[PDB]
């Protein structure tokens, strides 16, 4: 029983989830997504 419980606890620790949430939030902050600016943009492209 204790062997089973420690196997389950170790698997659950390996099964943690908040780290990915923190990483995604950090990436969102680093990239700093936004929409503020012009209504639409006109740009330059040399279409083949």
């Amino acid at each position: 029983g204790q062997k089973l419980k420690q196997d389950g606890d170790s698997f659950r620790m390996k099964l943690n989830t908040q780290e990915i949430f923190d990483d995604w939030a950090r990436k969102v902050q680093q990239r700093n997504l936004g929409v503020s600016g012009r209504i639409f943009t006109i740009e330059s492209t040399r279409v083949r």
């Binding site: 012009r38 943009t41 006109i42 330059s44």
Partner: peptide, 28 residues
């Protein structure tokens, strides 16, 4: 005095309008 149709509707090719609006967006 038979009147003739005046200047017709122009095309104003999209490229010219687009570049003019590039300029306007640049200076705004």
């Amino acid at each position: 005095r038979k009147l003739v149709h005046d200047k017709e509707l122009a095309a104003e090719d999209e490229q010219v309008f687009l570049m003019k609006q590039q300029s306007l967006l640049a200076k705004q």
